[PDB]
Nucleic acid binder design. Structure first.
Ligand SMILES: Nc1ncnc2c1ncn2[C@@H]1O[C@H](COP(=O)(O)OP(=O)(O)OP(=O)(O)O)[C@@H](O)[C@H]1O
Ligand SMILES: [Mg+2]
Ligand SMILES: [Mg+2]
Ligand SMILES: [Mg+2]
Ligand SMILES: [Zn+2]
Ligand SMILES: [Zn+2]
Ligand SMILES: [Zn+2]
Lengths: 85, 105, 642, 171, 280, 97, 112, 161
DNA sequence: CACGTCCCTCTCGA
RNA sequence: AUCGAGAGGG
């Protein structure tokens, strides 16, 4: 309904360790459910290491919808979020 | 404002003028200004255009703001009213200056 | 299991709290509770169409329920009811009933005060529901008369100073009147649609007239079960028959010859059962007992054990526990798990091209072989026990099946001492399956859990999905937690053996010869394989304690500490200075290598990384301990002698 | 009647379909379980209009289950019959107690007693018919009936019609 | 109780520390939006010490033959000697240093100069001297333009709350204010070239790493700071009164004013067991 | 083994949000109740292998939702109901901030 | 002014033995009681009386009593406190739950 | 999973799901959409054929085989309700070509009648104003009989062969 | 006048 | 088996 536009953002531009952790996890759970791998599986088996390689190449097709207390939010795409860690 | 020496008749008689805030303070607590004490920080009144600003800039609901008692020894000193906000500047050991805000419940 | 239901799946976002109406209880009730008989048509396993399964839940595992045909595991249960012959105060709303009767004209049904009073229009301004209803009752119990105007409004009956004897109310006039359940109910029902709403109530979800029970809801078996060994119902299934016994007395006692004294007794009796049934730890009262006390529904929920120990805390599958022993040849972020635990603890891996080749080998290894598996879960989902299934051999795995397989080397597990007073007291380690029945953890991770290896016991939890997995390894990993927010310092560090021998080692008198030096150098797995030019060469190639230690400290580290009188030409090997990961001077002690505010651990974890420092922990426990092995160290009564 | 309601459906997708041919399989699955459907609340869903413009938004990755969920806002042609609306329909079934009319995707039923008195049942006919003065409702004639009552049974809502009134009968 | 009154308390995406109602407990966790792990007890040399030594250690007088950066420490010490358009900034710099010194002495009335703050600067400069191998003899290839302006720009990029309107921006200045004091303290134009001997590369390296090591120290929106402070306060109390017999009869202030008073403090309670007025 | 109160607090500080749900659901009670879209209780007779859903008394057959909650919750709710307390579980919402 | 005294009286019993906990924690609790208007004690009446969700406050003392006056005042639980989700078996808006995760058809075909 | 939207005799007392004031899919507001047996066939045909156009990037009593093929190309087989509807619609559509149907809509929609009447008027072929108002009792007291009979006349005329 | 830390392991008696 | 009672361990 309401929502925020991507030119009025204000949240920390880096990836929250909880976001990184739930994205590496989320993709791992999805990758382990035989979901398409968008990265170049270079001799990989573990579905987490694939997701870590997917998050290292930022080829993860996920958007983090960061909910602010007022109810409204502002999505950030995994590929646009910096990954300082 | 009136300064009752030792007592005041409850002849209640105060809240009685619509376009007037009828304030009352005693001479005993006014002997030493409390706002001069080590632990009492700067309390600043907020204009109705400042409150309506801080509430939208922090995306707040009025209830969600930290509250300052109506009869707070400082809320009276500044003659606060219901709904007035007061930015509070305290010297913190992590940022040096930390802005807090309280609404007068 | 639980079959698939077309119904959409949602999460709960609002929980509406309110009160039943006697009419809504009659509505939902899948069966009227008519008999107090347990479940004895002929005491057969067939239950009685009166109590227990007149349509509610099922009593027998081999029996589908009479409402939702799913039977047992799936049947939520289905509430019944029993129409009360006489209204009854709710044990919990007892005081809240009085607080209202004090506020409203016990004859007029309108409020004792209204908006014409300065304090009532003030108290009424309070939209805080419960602070208003308190600010109303405060200034309402006093004015005890149905006024007629005083500038009209409204008949005038004086109001009684009400008090409670326990389960019944009385009010004085000037008259000792025991206020009736229906009479109060009749007053509450007549309360202005808007009057009770402004009194901290609600027009649809919490009408006052429902603090008085005209129709009781009967919970289904799953709430008050019954188990066999022959059978025996639940302490609340009993309490119900007790309530129904107390009701059927009133049902007939009042139908025919009305003796009023008896009527006014079996009613108070019934009020008792309905009261203790909900709360049996009442104020006055004897507190009932059946062949004893009895279990009040309120007692099921009382804090600590009872949905605070059923919902705030549960017992869980995929868990373990054993004695813990310390290992100096393990890595910091590891936990030596006994083989047996790794054969009982599983992980539902999903079949995929990435793992299918490993997975099928495990299956063939089975539940007895260490690197084996226990269950295989198909497309259809029914479980396939690899210990007893005939096809436990010629079984062909499909993509997308789940292979509940044994927990193997380097899975993430939640590890914890029990006084869980710490974010650190629950950490995630890599599994490392090992023999003997002890959990084994690296000696440096003792201080976080505050564990010693003296009959100490530690829990182990195991994730079940690849995301809770990553959640443990990306947040709760032991090396991720090396520096605590608690005191903004390292919460792990060198302790015991390693510490004692690391100042013994880092000395000038302490020299290491070649046959001993090459052993030390090898133990460092991340070793550059290059022999450090010996601090002393020619008389006899010797190495300094700190010098040899430095190959384990990672090049790129700079640390600086000055103790008492520590100079730039250290007098008593004072203080500490490490430059580019090699020791310059100074003895290594708790200050240097402990969990110090600016210790080596702290510096290495910040300017190098969490997992880098972790490997440091091991790289030192593997070397320092090795040196102490061949130097040795003891303690006797000689050391307590001056 | 025959309306166009702005509907929305919550479809859930397994992660294996989290590829490029996803929006396709979302629409494919949207119509799979909506196209030839019926409800009663909204009525006979008949055909989702405007295939091209069909929002899907961003799908929520379910908490402890990888699958994503989308609210597929769409628009479709529906059909909810109403008690009191006249509808012309083709006669299909024809019994001794009445005859069924095929109006749209549903079948309105007419009772012998809802037909005017003079319409007598004609068992003697390969296509059983209701002979009368002028009309002869055969197995496959066109009739204009007035819906009298509506019943919603699962994925189908039937009805009961009358032709006893005026301006009602054959075409 | 602690864990139960602080459950829902977690840093939120605007760096507010709120509960489950949205009620604001703090506007930046720890009044500086920082994470507790990236924080270290380093010293702000701008405060304690002699007014005389302060000049010695920070003041740079370009219009002077005695108090000017000797051309051996800068690249242009002799060509900047007397330069006055530049000494305006060495004043601006030295002026904000004293505005600093006199501010700290307002916050830390007792004159204690060692406090915890993110980014170990005492470390970073060292980890830069070893990195670029600093020549304690050869002069520095830095301009006064370089130092005082790099610092001024470094501060603008030390973000805590990211925002646009004055309300939030003015609480940016606040949140950082203290950290910047250590920054200006340790990046004094005299220090950089006299005792640090920074080259240009070494300097710019120190600036960029400071920027990140700070931007890392910002607490993460999600952190359950409340259920954490609760444990952080409750663990040592429950754990201190478990190691009381390691010394047998010692008592001390274990169960004397610790466990007791703390129970008072949490319950508040007017019937305090020792009401004392320490009147100065 | 009991994953008790204190252990919950620890994972909370960790922020292990979905590992905590895994702790208290997949590895414990966790039940599939059929709540009603208007009353908000288990009363939704679930004849799912015939696919009939009803909260008669609310006379509802479409507004049904299956929801994942601990059986301990399901009990706690029934128990509250047995004391004439309605804990109507709602999938939608009406506040905001 | 009191908030500072509260902290100072909290820190003064911490700095004795085990003489360090970081300001933030103490200040948060301290601020917790403070930011209400007066002292809000850490006790089953002090804080537990707030306008929090019903189930939340029932997870700490006065357990059945709280759920009573909740359904009697027709209370509503936000479902925003951790305890609520814990009781309900849902991922709590806590760190790894403070955000939601979505796939945009855009990205999925940007790497098709 | 089941369908939802935003928000009883046949005298305009429809459900709430078919109440005049109903919300859009953007969130605005727009009048109810009632189509006459004819306006419904085009709407379907158009939508069904414009689905085949995007499935390429991956007469009187003889048109009925032309629709069956479209239904056996785009829609899934099991969808049987759509087949009967198109059959039905194809026979009982008073108006065949878009041009005529528009005029019908142009005529009816400018009378103020609530869409159900707009719909029912274009689908039921009446002569008398007495017949029209007795089959669509939602009127009766609204449009005058003469004016209604005037409008009824333009209908029978526009009845495309 | 209601709380009274956390888990874990066994024994026995209606 | 469930309730109660008790003794230990960390
Ligand atoms: N009553 C208790 N409640 C909670 N935790 C306890 C309790 N008793 C012991 N513990 C926990 O178990 C450990 C108790 O110490 P332990 O019995 O192992 O003795 P110790 O310190 O090794 O004694 P010693 O001085 O003889 O070596 C601590 O980690 C403490 O947290
Ligand atoms: Mg021990
Ligand atoms: Mg010990
Ligand atoms: Mg002990
Ligand atoms: Zn059932
Ligand atoms: Zn009156
Ligand atoms: Zn219902």
């Amino acid at each position: 309904e309401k929502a925020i536009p991507k030119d009025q953002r204000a949240t920390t531009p880096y990836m929250t360790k909880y976001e990184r952790a739930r994205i590496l996890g989320t993709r791992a759970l999805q990758i382990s459910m035989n979901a398409p791998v968008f990265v170049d599986l270079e001799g990989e088996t573990d579905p987490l290491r694939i997701a870590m390689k997917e998050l290292a190449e930022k080829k993860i097709p996920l958007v983090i919808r960061r909910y602010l207390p007022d109810g409204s939010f502002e999505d950030w795409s995994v590929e646009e979020l910096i990954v300082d860690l | 404002i009136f300064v009752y020496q030792n007592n005041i008749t409850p002849s209640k008689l105060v809240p009685s003028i619509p376009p007037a805030t009828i304030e009352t303070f005693n001479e005993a607590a006014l002997v030493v200004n409390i706002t001069h004490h080590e632990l009492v920080p700067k309390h600043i009144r907020l204009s109705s255009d400042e409150k309506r600003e801080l509430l939208k800039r922090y995306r707040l609901k009025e209830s969600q703001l930290p509250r300052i008692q109506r009869a707070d020894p400082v809320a009276l000193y500044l003659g606060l009213k219901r709904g007035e906000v007061v930015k509070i500047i305290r010297k913190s050991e992590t940022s040096g200056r930390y802005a807090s805000y309280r609404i007068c419940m | 299991g639980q079959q698939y239901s077309s119904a959409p799946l949602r999460t709960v976002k609002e929980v509406q709290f309110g009160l039943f109406s006697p009419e809504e209880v009659r509505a939902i009730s899948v069966a009227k509770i008519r008999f107090p008989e347990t479940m004895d048509e002929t005491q057969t396993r067939a239950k009685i169409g009166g109590l227990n399964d007149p349509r509610l839940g099922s009593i027998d595992r081999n029996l589908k329920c009479q409402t939702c045909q799913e039977g047992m595991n799936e049947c939520p249960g289905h509430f019944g009811h029993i129409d009360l012959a006489k209204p009854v105060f709710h044990v919990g709303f007892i005081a809240k009933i009085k607080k209202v009767c004090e506020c409203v004209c016990m004859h007029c049904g309108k409020l004792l005060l209204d908006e014409h009073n300065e304090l009532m229009r003030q108290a009424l301004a309070i939209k805080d529901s419960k602070k208003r209803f308190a600010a109303i009752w405060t200034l309402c119990k006093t004015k005890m008369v149905c006024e007629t105007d005083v500038p009209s409004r409204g008949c005038g009956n004086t109001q009684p100073t009400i008090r409670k004897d326990g389960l019944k109310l009385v009010g004085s006039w000037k008259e000792l009147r025991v206020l009736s359940t229906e009479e109060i109910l009749n007053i509450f029902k007549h309360i202005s649609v808007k009057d009770f709403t402004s009194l901290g109530f609600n027009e649809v979800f919490s009408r006052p007239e429902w603090m008085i029970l005209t129709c009781l809801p009967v919970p289904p078996p799953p709430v008050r079960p019954s188990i066999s060994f022959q059978r025996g119902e639940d302490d609340l299934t009993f309490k119900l028959a007790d309530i129904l016994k107390a009701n059927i007395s009133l049902e007939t006692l009042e139908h025919n010859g009305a003796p009023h004294h008896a009527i006014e007794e079996a009613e108070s009796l019934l009020q008792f059962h309905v009261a203790t049934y909900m709360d049996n730890d009442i104020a006055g009262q004897p507190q009932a007992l059946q062949k004893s006390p009895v279990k009040s529904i309120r007692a099921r929920l009382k804090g600590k054990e009872g949905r605070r120990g059923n919902l705030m805390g549960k017992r869980v599958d995929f868990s373990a526990r054993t004695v813990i022993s310390g290992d100096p040849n393990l890595e910091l972020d590891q936990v030596g798990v006994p083989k047996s635990i790794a054969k009982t603890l599983t992980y539902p891996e999903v079949v995929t091209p990435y793992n299918i080749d490993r997975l099928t080998q495990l299956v063939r290894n089975g539940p007895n072989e260490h690197p084996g598996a226990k269950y295989v879960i198909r497309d259809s989902g029914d479980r396939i026990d690899l210990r007893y299934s005939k096809r436990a051999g010629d079984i062909q795995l499909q993509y997308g099946w789940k292979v509940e397989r044994h927990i193997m080397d380097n899975d993430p597990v939640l590890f914890n001492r029990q006084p869980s007073l710490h974010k650190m007291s629950m950490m995630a380690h890599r599994v490392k399956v090992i023999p003997y029945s002890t959990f084994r953890l690296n000696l440096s991770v003792t201080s976080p859990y505050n564990a010693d290896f003296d009959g100490d016991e530690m829990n182990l939890h195991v994730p079940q999905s690849e995301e809770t997995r990553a959640e443990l390894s990306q947040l709760c990993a032991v090396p991720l937690q090396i520096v605590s927010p608690q005191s903004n310092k390292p919460c792990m560090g060198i302790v015991q053996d390693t510490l004692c021998g690391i100042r013994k080692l880092t000395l000038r008198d302490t020299f290491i010869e070649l046959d001993q030096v090459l052993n030390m150098l090898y133990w460092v797995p991340d070793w550059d394989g290059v022999i450090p030019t010996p601090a002393i060469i020619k008389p006899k190639p010797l190495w300094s304690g700190k010098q040899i230690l430095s190959v384990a400290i990672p090049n790129g580290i700079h640390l600086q500490r000055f103790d008492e009188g520590t100079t730039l030409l250290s007098p008593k090997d004072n203080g500490m200075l490490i430059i580019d990961g090699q020791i310059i001077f100074g003895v290594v002690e708790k200050k240097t290598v402990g969990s110090s505010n600016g210790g080596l651990i702290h510096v290495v974890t910040r300017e190098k990384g969490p997992q880098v420092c972790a490997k440091l922990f091991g790289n030192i426990q593997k070397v320092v301990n090795f040196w102490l092995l061949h130097n040795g160290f003891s303690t006797g009564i000689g050391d307590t002698i001056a | 009647m025959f309306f166009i309601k702005d509907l929305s459906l919550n479809i859930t997708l397994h992660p294996s379909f989290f590829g490029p041919r996803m929006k396709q399989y979302l629409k494919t699955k949207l119509l799979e379980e909506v196209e030839g459907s019926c409800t009663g609340k909204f009525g006979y869903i008949l055909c989702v209009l405007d295939y091209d413009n069909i929002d899907i938004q961003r799908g929520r990755i379910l908490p402890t289950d990888g699958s994503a969920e989308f609210n597929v806002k769409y628009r479709a042609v529906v059909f909810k019959p109403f008690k009191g609306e006249v509808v012309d329909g083709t006669v299909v079934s024809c019994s001794q107690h009445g005859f069924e009319v095929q109006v749209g995707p549903m079948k309105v039923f007419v009772t012998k007693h809802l037909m005017p008195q003079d319409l007598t049942f004609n068992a003697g006919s390969n296509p059983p018919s209701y002979q009368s003065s002028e009309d002869v409702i055969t197995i496959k004639s066109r009739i204009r009936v007035k819906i009298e009552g509506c019943i919603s049974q699962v994925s189908s809502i039937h009805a009961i019609g009358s032709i006893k009134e005026d301006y009602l009968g054959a075409i | 109780r602690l864990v139960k009154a602080l459950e829902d308390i977690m840093v939120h995406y605007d760096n507010t520390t709120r509960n489950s109602l949205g009620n604001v407990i703090q506007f930046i966790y720890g009044e500086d939006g920082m994470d507790a792990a990236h924080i270290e007890k380093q010293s702000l040399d701008t405060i304690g010490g002699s007014d005389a030594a302060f000049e010695k250690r920070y003041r740079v007088d370009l219009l002077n033959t005695d108090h000017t950066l000797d051309p051996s420490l800068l690249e242009s010490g002799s060509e900047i000697l007397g330069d006055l358009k530049l000494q305006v900034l060495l004043d601006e710099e030295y002026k904000q240093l004293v505005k600093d010194r006199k501010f700290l002495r307002e916050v830390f009335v007792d004159g204690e100069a060692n406090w915890p703050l993110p980014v170990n600067i005492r470390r970073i400069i060292q980890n830069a001297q070893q990195t670029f191998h600093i020549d304690h003899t050869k002069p520095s290839d830095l301009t006064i333009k370089d130092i005082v302006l790099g610092v001024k720009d470094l501060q603008e990029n030390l973000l805590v709350l990211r925002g646009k309107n004055e309300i939030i921006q003015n609480a940016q200045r606040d949140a950082v204010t203290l950290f910047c004091c250590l920054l200006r303290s340790r990046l004094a134009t005299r220090r950089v070239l006299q005792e640090y001997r920074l080259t240009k590369q070494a300097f710019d390296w120190v600036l960029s790493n400071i920027e990140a090591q700070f931007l890392r120290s910002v607490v993460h929106p999600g952190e359950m700071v409340g259920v954490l402070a609760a444990q952080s306060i409750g663990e040592p109390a429950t754990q201190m009164t478990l190691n009381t017999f390691h010394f047998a009869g010692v008592a001390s202030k274990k169960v004397t004013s610790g466990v007791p008073r703390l129970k008072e403090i949490l319950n508040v309670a007017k019937n305090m067991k020792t009401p004392s007025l320490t009147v100065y | 083994l009991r994953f008790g109160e204190m252990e919950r607090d620890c994972m909370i500080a960790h922020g292990a949000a979905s590992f905590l749900k895994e702790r208290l659901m997949e590895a414990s009670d966790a039940f599939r109740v059929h709540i009603c879209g208007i009353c908000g209780l288990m009363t939704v007779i679930a004849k799912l292998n015939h696919n009939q859903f009803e909260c008669k008394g609310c006379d509802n057959k479409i507004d049904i939702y299956q929801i994942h909650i601990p059986y301990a919750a399901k009990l706690l709710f029934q128990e509250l109901m047995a004391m004439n307390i309605t804990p109507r579980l709602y999938t939608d919402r009406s506040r905001d901030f | 002014a009191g908030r500072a005294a509260l902290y100072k009286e909290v820190y003064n019993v911490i700095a004795s033995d085990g003489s360090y906990v970081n300001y933030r924690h103490m200040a948060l609790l301290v601020d917790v009681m403070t930011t209400q208007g007066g002292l809000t004690s850490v006790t089953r009446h002090g804080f537990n009386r707030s306008n929090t969700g019903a189930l939340m406050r029932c997870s700490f003392e006065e357990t059945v009593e709280i759920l009573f006056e909740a359904g009697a005042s027709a209370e509503l639980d936000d479902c925003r406190g951790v305890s609520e989700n814990v009781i309900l078996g849902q991922m709590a808006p806590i760190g790894t739950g403070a955000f939601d995760v979505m796939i945009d058809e855009e990205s999925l075909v940007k790497y098709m | 999973v089941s369908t939802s939207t935003f928000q009883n005799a046949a005298t305009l007392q429809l459900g709430q799901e078919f109440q005049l004031k109903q919300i859009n899919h953007q969130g605005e507001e727009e009048e109810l959409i009632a189509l006459n047996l004819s306006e419904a066939r085009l709407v379907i045909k158009e939508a069904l054929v414009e689905r085949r156009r995007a499935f390429k990037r991956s007469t009187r009593e003889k048109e009925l085989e032309s629709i069956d093929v479209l239904l056996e190309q785009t829609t899934g087989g099991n969808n049987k309700d759509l087949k009967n509807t198109m059959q039905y619609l194809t026979n009982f559509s008073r108006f065949r070509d878009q041009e005529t149907v528009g005029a019908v809509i142009q005529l009816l929609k400018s009378t103020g009648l609530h869409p159900f009447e707009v719909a029912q008027l274009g689908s039921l072929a009446c002569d008398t104003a007495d017949e029209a108002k007795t089959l669509i009792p939602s009127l009766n007291n609204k449009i005058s009989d003469d004016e209604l009979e005037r409008i009824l006349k333009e209908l029978s005329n526009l009845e495309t062969l």
